[PDB]
Amino acid sequence: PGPALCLFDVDGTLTAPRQKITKEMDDFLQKLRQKIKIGVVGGSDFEKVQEQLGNDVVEKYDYVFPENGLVAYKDGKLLCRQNIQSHLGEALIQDLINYCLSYIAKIKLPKKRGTFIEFRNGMLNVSPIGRSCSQEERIEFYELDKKENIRQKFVADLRKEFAGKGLTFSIGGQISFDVFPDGWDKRYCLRHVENDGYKTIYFFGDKTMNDHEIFTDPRTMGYSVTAPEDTRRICELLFS
């Protein structure tokens, strides 16, 4: 019904994987923006979104939410820049860091490299081996991790240590896990849209990483898409 907004995931939703958006797709969205407002959200940073969607990305969408909406543009103008250290405070930042440093120092492994802690605007990415390891070194860690459950245990330990502090944990891939404030997934971006009068907020993306929370969130009407051809097919069905 009513005034409405379409929000799209960027890679695989609007583009072919690792490819820039198509002229055909782009023309399609600008034609859609005639009747309904459009925005984009993704885990990547602004430079990445530009590569994928074009340098003029902010003139092309009514909202643009790099880094899950921790960076936000509305109507072409930079709305907010939020980061983990401002939300959590420095002392907590540093207590998390200090704990993870000392814990990693105690884990027995076949190899250790560097970038044990990667600091991002939205998360601490932590790797017992270190993110700089080579492919063969990562595979070795990953098989050890499967047998030993090194990441699961670190995360459990941390979850105990930092109970009450409003942090979520997330293991994936082969060598690291993420620590970030609660709700700092794609759901973050909804705070920027939910007071602009939309009667419906459509979300187009993957419904599954598990589960993408924005997809299942009570504010959105989530539609899972398999490719830009699909996004178009469903937009044709819903709109027009």
Curated annotation (Swiss-Prot):
This is Phosphomannomutase 2. Changing residue 136 to K: In CDG1A; this mutation seems to disrupt a splicing enhancer sequence and thus results in most cases in a protein with exon 5 skipped; slightly reduced activity. Changing residue 174 to H: In CDG1A; partial loss of activity. Pfam families: PMM (PF03332). Homodimer. It comes from Homo sapiens. Involved in the synthesis of the GDP-mannose and dolichol-phosphate-mannose required for a number of critical mannosyl transfer reactions. The modification N6-acetyllysine is found at residue 146. It catalyses: alpha-D-mannose 1-phosphate = D-mannose 6-phosphate. Its EC number is 5.4.2.8. It comes from the Eukaryota. InterPro entries: HAD-like_sf, HAD-SF_hydro_IIB, HAD_sf, PMM, PMM_cap. It is found in: Cytoplasm. GO terms for cellular component: cilium; cytosol; microtubule cytoskeleton; neuronal cell body; nucleoplasm.
